[PDB]
Amino acid sequence: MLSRFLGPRYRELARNWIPTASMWGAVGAVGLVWATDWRLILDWVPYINGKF
Amino acid sequence: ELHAPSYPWSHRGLLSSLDHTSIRRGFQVYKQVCSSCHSMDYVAYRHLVGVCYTEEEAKALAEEVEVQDGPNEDGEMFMRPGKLSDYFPKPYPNPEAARAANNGALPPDLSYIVRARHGGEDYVFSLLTGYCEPPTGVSLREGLYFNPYFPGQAIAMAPPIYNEVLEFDDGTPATMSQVAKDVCTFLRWASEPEHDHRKRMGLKMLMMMGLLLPLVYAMKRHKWSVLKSRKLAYRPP
Amino acid sequence: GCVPIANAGDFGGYYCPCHGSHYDASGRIRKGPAPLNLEVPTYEFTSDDLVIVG
Amino acid sequence: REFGHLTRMRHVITYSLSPFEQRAFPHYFTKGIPNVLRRTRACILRVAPPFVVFYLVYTWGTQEFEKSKRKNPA
Amino acid sequence: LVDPLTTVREQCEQIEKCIKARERLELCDQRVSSRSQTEEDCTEELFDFLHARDHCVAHKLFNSL
Amino acid sequence: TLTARLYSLLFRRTSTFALTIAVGALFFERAFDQGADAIYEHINQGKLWKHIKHKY
Amino acid sequence: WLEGIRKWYYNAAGFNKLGLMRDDTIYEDDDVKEAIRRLPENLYNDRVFRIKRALDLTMRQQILPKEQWTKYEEDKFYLEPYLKEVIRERKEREEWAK
Amino acid sequence: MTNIRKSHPLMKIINNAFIDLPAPSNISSWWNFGSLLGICLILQILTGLFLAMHYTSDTTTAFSSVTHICRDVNYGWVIRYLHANGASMFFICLFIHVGRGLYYGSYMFLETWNIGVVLLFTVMATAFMGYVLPWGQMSFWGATVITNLLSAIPYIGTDLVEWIWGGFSVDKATLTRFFAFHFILPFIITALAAVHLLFLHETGSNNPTGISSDMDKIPFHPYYTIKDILGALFMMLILLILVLFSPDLLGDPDNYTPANPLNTPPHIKPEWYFLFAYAILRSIPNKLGGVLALVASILILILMPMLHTSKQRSMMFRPLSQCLFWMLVADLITLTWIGGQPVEHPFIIIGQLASILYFLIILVLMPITSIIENNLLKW
Ligand code: HEM
């Protein structure tokens, strides 16, 4: 809940898992841009903007 | 807006049915009044038989009209006498022709007209008998007509039916109110052909529901009789 | 519905004869049985000689 | 979760009877009607008022809409 | 050939709902006719005059048919 | 006690019970159809294409 | 004062009619089932008999007769000490976890 | 030798499902609706199959095919009206089931509650989609409005309405894809219902009291089969009353008219079981906020397990909560009535106020009332 997650060791777990979850987020964002062929992002990246 | 009254139709009863003689008279009204401008394509002369006409009368009625259908050996659309297979004739070849013919307005399909307007027959009847003179302060463009019941207070249809507008086959007077009643009940039959059957559908079920409900419930209570009479006692040491 | 005939309807622009609704020439309606103005589509005016409607 | 180890219970004595030896409708109206009135009295004060306020607001909305459609002498 | 509807309507004219409705309609008639250009169209009290008359009629007419 | 002999002769065996249901279904459909239909045209006498076809 | 409102609410609650003490009506979450397991034998047996009788009554939809209803002053919070102990132990474990 | 009932795999599953499954004795009629829903599912699916056997999904034949079913097909009108009023009765039973779940704290079965919310979503989608199939004026126009509501979604939203429509607007492609999805979805509903029953059967049903009924459990087959039979019979009584005496009662007459995209109907309204959330949509001025409120009006059911704070699971012993629940029910009735009415004075203000009161009761009044409830009982 609110207080039971508000502990020192819980923020320690949060700090430990920030990198993996944060770059899982990057994995998801890159996968979404890839799957949708998002021209807003894919235009800037090199060697792929040629597909447009 | 002004909606329709609640006329005591002969078929408005919970287990009542339409008067089929009036169905036949209303169909005559449809033939010789509005069949020249209105279409009822969803119904056919086959539906007529057994509820308002016999087989021979239906055959004669069908052959009284001419329907153009089929490509011949040369491919031309040939006209032949209508038969029981054919649906009701469409007065205008294509809808745009109908609009251009009358005033640009389209006569709605009379097949589902009663089941489509909020109020049912009581609406349409009220319209047909509701042809009034425009009130003070309301102008009328030459070609339109004033009807309080029609949304917009201005209908694009000339007064269809009036006194002696027809001659019923039976011999009942062709006065305007009677014609309106007959045509409205015929349109109710056309919109909901199953009406009579539905009523006969319901009555049996109702009597059936007067027999299954008191039984099954009893059976349930019978099967509950063990629990509802169950008695308990606490005997701690 | 129907189709408003042009060059009619007192104001001048359009006239729907079904129930006598006159329309403003610019595309609106000044008054009449019709509730609101005539719909305007997402047309484009590029190359006036060849104007495309979306 | 099935019959045989649902829970633990002791010193409980229960009786019942065959459905073929007792009436299926034991005084269905002698105590049924008083029971219905008792339950109705128990639940009426907490059930009705939310529906009655809806009745009033429905009537007021309908009448006010009709009045608004009427012309307002101008 | 006279109509059942016209005589039923005439008999339904002389009931007090339709009497007040007719008075209100006549007042609007004189008001709108007197005033040169007014959007005030006597449609609404005409509608109440109807709503009284057609209901009175519908209660009786179908027996005459 | 008619019910006692009825049960002892045609209800105890489930096979004869099912025969009773199946056979009585015939005649219940018969009688119920006829009674309900008769009630139906009694309420609507003269308005169906069964009491006026002789006219045409 | 508030005790009148409390008594009115106890009368209007309903479980007094069914011959249930207050602790018979509490939702059975993890703490509650652990506390129920922690109950002594006699209290647990009376509790289960009371609950079974109440379920019978609401199955038949017959409220228990007037005279032997659970009075306000006769209502004993038997579960309360065990539930308090269970909650305290759980809170201590959670504090240790944090 | 062992019982075929509880040794054969299929028969063992059926036995543990609804033959020898322990059930609370004091289960009232409010639970019967569950089985009714299943019945109202099957009675739907079968009928749908027959309708699909005389329906030609196309803008040139949809209305004509439905008319042909109604008139010409032997006993086709009965199937058609059976289908329509069965969908209406399905939604009646669904709403009553949700009300029961709210009232007696049945949302403490979190997994079953969430699966039920998913089922409810799927049922609304199926009914909205199916109402398009007759291709009447109301069908097409309402479909245009509801699908165009997705244009309010930022960025992708506009493209989505082009994707769902299969083009620039609701046309034949939309009709046929709606037909296909309307065919497939009820079987997904059946699978989700099986999962929902599995989750519930793991823990067992909840009695009206809210106390665990493990001490008093009765076998399902001898009792809770014939009771459900009686419930289904009563449901059939109501449903055939609707079909056989007032067929087009709840349905708008404007459907019995060919879908003409050249004429907007006088009032565009969805079904009576859709008017409450559509009125919620109407209440919020912002377009995107309207869709958010519309989806939240049903998604709020998932929050209910978290918002419970009273120590008693059910509501039999919480009269204040009972009054709040009935206020909520009256508010939903007001939402439906407002959705039926046009957005004019005073319907605008009434709809807005009732829309606020809906969320205010669910999120605020119920938990605060539960806190006062616990405080009033020494705990
Ligand atoms: C989840 C259960 C179902 C619901 C709630 C549902 C809902 C609806 C609704 C509301 C309609 C419109 C009725 C009307 O015209 O007024 C409809 C039509 C239709 N449904 Fe379903 N349906 C269900 C199951 C099915 C299934 C399983 C099929 C396919 C086998 C099916 C096939 C059809 C067809 C063909 C139509 C068009 C015919 C018609 O509109 O009457 N339905 N459905």
Ligand code: HEM
């Ligand atoms: C597809 C329609 C549905 C079917 C076929 C279905 C089926 C069932 C059945 C048969 C039961 C047992 C009887 C009962 O408790 O009523 C049940 C219980 C339950 N259902 Fe559903 N259900 C459906 C929709 C829903 C919905 C929309 C919800 C709410 C989100 C829901 C939540 C529950 C809950 C909480 C229970 C347990 C009630 C209790 O134990 O007292 N179900 N379901």
